[PDB]
């Protein structure tokens, strides 16, 4: 944290900030020039494959790649070797299902939240349907709040528990420390989908009691696309069956068979996205120079004014009224308009917002609604942007 | 077509001024214009994807669709047969898992003996696991396949998996012929095109390909983290997606899921939008040059390299027939371990790989310590080969 000005100093580094009001941060973040500069120095000044090749470019590439992995480890409070690069969260999550499927005896149980993004349920659905498991969901309200007692009940007996850290559609910050304690207490394996928290707030494997953790570099960490992370705790290195296998993943091969290498290269099949990982590390550097603390507060501040303003205007919004449990995402609807129409109207005013089911149709169904419109923030978003949003919403609403 | 001097091309690659990069089968050097294409996504139209209403997502989606269409045309495939992955090895692994459900114990798979671990281990595991017959087509130590032994091994296998080119030796296997055999015998044909893809013509129809994998960071002069899996139209109701979730569905509930149409059915999560656009920029850059001109320039490099090594009497490997030798030449200095040779070349600003090369039954085949590999692309020049021979001369004394 090098004391400098929020949001302006971050805005200085993101040209799109002068062009549009970008409230679509849960879809993906905007990307600061230093993140793109860090990638461009890889591609133009030390371009090479890794795997400890002798020549000097590959030394650099390899150094830079392992630096990236250490930075990603430290960001999340893990050990170097516990970190696996993937293309995205979704890959990471599918890898947990495909990795561990051999452990599951028929009639074993898995438990998750009802609010999951599609990539943290239907891998668990496929696996259940395939193996004859019981897939159980813990109760909670329309506001997003989990029934913790029902959790303590439903988690009793489970071989595995999978939960989102924050919901991409409601903005619920679930109480995953409590949820983790409870899974640890009850023996179960705890897998945490941290896609919408990573980069926006503290995600630490120790505090969260996590055995598996997934996030995407293109969201809150301000990294490029094509770079996810999968955390695998040391404990599971001799249970977890590498789903992807090939180049970079062995110490000897023959036409007969194979013998695998150590983590983390055990789980990384082929040429990794070295460019992406270096981009990702620059994002995390960018983030920890700002401070998770300062990012939290900005976001919280934009949510408070957004929610007050929408209250003033007779516009209903979803997720926790208790803003301590509300991430930098506010979903909402204008009665009389479809969400896609609200979002086209905002787009006409250069305000970017998502509309539809947000890859979380179950949520939409639990609320009895045909989609929502979604404004989501990051630290580079400003109160002026919010105000000009509430302005057009106001013109919108009293045009009905 | 069209319209330029090789080797320049060099003009777009600053590193070409600092070093002689002869490590192209590992990864390619990347032209400024490809990086420029990615930079405008990240700085001028950054967004997902999934036809979202705002103009950035419109632009990004349009450009991502464009990207897929360009890849499709590059290999003569249809839009919806192209799935994006992180690399070749994901693509091949995805083929293993994507139709493991069609095999039964005692069904046979056939490969080449050479042969990248990424086009081997997912077949070795899938055989051990389901109790399958795994059989290797015969070839000599130059790497030329016996096409007679091909004809008797393809009859009657469920699938055939071959390199288009070896990354150790540089053989171009005669895959239009292997595809014909597989087709005639009714095997599913999978082609690992990780070494052919931006150096020579690769065309799914000509190849009789049912599945095809390649990597953007190699020959297509694209970024890292982007790979392609071609799935022919005929396997859409057979092939099950091993990765599923966001972007993969028509409807979902707590009860279950219904999947979407291809290609998006096989693409889970936010794709690497950046890499896709970059890869498209790469193939655009390659098409502007011409694959025939790339083939010819690599061929000159290989001709002068090998005929110069003959001159120095250093042993080299792969087909003596240059028609059947890609832009890679593995060699060794008798009494020098390959890493020392590579260390010495590096000291002269010459980048080159050494070791087993994620190949290995080749390093046994063909029993030897390992090999030093110089590999090429269109931006490499004769004068660079010439100076490489010069330090080889000095080293041989």
Numbering used by the authors:
A (entry chain B): -2 to 397
B (entry chain A): -1 to 395
Please give me the paper's original passages concerning this structure:
The crystal structure of native ToCDS (NAT) was determined to be 2.6 Å. There was a dimer with a twofold symmetry in the asymmetric unit. A protomer of ToCDS comprised three domains. The larger central domain having PLP binding site contained residues 17–285 and comprised nine α-helices surrounding a nine β-stranded, mainly parallel β-sheet. The two active sites were located in the center of the PLP-binding domain at the dimer interface. PLP was Schiff-base linked with Lys216 at the active site. The PLP pyridine ring was well stacked with His114 and bound to Ala192 with van der Waals interaction at the opposite side. 5′-phosphate of PLP was tightly bound via hydrogen bonds with the nearby residues of Ser87, His215, Ser213, and Thr268. However, the internal dihedral angle showed flexible conformational changes from 38° to 69°: the internal dihedral angle got wider in the order of NAT, IAA, and GD structures.
